[PDB]
From a paper:
Antibody has become the most prominent class of protein therapeutics and diagnostics. Experimental platforms based on phage display of synthetic antibody libraries provide rich information on antibody-antigen interactions. In this work, the aim is to use the data generated from phage-displayed antibody libraries to develop and calibrate computational tools for rational design of antibodies.
The rationalization led to insights for a machine learning methodology, aiming at designing interface CDR sequences against designated epitopes on antigens of known structure. The results suggest that computational antibody design could effectively empower the high throughput recombinant protein library-based technologies.
Author numbering: 12 to 117, 135 to 253
């Protein structure tokens, strides 16, 4: 597994400041790095792909650079709407392994559902419905965020359902799947633990361009109490 670390882990600046956030990968990842922006209470959105490429719709004050192990995100002139947590993530190998990102202070979709309250030992099933594309053409990943905690990759299924992958923390307890007639992916969660409490996101990925998690669902909250 390749680890990403950022610095700093948070910062406050003023409107108009130049902000740079650096990122390091534990191994050479070439230029296969993406940056994401995550508003509070929102799913991450793709800003930059392939290290220096602006995802469409992203303002040109955002720029990226680097290759090998060292990467940086620069916001040339910080705007009021730029406050968010920013994540550097390598997509050179799979599975992705997210961390804490950098907290900055001043059609196609996935829709999730099925979140709720359940008790330890219980079980629950999340849904990741797709629109405007065929779900089996992509990897689908489930990534979660505990309250006041960081991003954690949970599970992935390959296109055509060829293979599945699980984080050690859920292996043997969760199943990732899909139903193609419903164009919808699932995470079936058994033997739930309090640790499992979090907002769950799903997102699509392939190694084709831009080879970044370009679409995420809005997230669904799972409370284990």
């Amino acid at each position: 597994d390749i680890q990403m670390t950022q610095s700093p882990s948070s910062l406050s600046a003023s409107v108009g400041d130049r902000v740079t956030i650096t990122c390091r990968a534990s191994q050479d990842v070439s230029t296969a790095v993406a940056w994401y922006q995550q508003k509070p209470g929102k799913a991450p959105k793709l800003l930059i792909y392939s290290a220096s490429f602006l995802y469409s719709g992203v303002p040109s004050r955002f720029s990226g650079s680097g290759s090998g192990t060292d990467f940086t995100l620069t916001i040339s002139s910080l705007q009021p709407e730029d406050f968010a947590t920013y994540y550097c993530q390598q997509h050179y190998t799979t599975p992705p392994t997210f961390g804490c990102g950098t907290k900055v202070e001043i059609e196609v979709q996935l829709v999730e559902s099925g979140g709720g309250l359940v008790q330890p030992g219980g079980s629950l099933r999340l849904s990741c419905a797709a629109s405007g594309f065929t779900i089996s053409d992509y990897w689908i990943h489930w990534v979660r965020q505990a309250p006041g905690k960081c991003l954690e990759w949970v599970a992935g299924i390959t296109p055509a359902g060829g293979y599945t992958y699980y984080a050690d923390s859920v292996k043997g307890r969760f199943t990732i799947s899909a139903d193609t007639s419903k164009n919808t992916a699932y995470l079936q969660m058994n033997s739930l633990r309090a640790e499992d409490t979090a907002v769950y996101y799903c997102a699509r990925f392939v190694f084709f361009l831009p080879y970044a998690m370009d679409y995420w669902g809005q997230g669904t909250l799972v409370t284990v109490s």
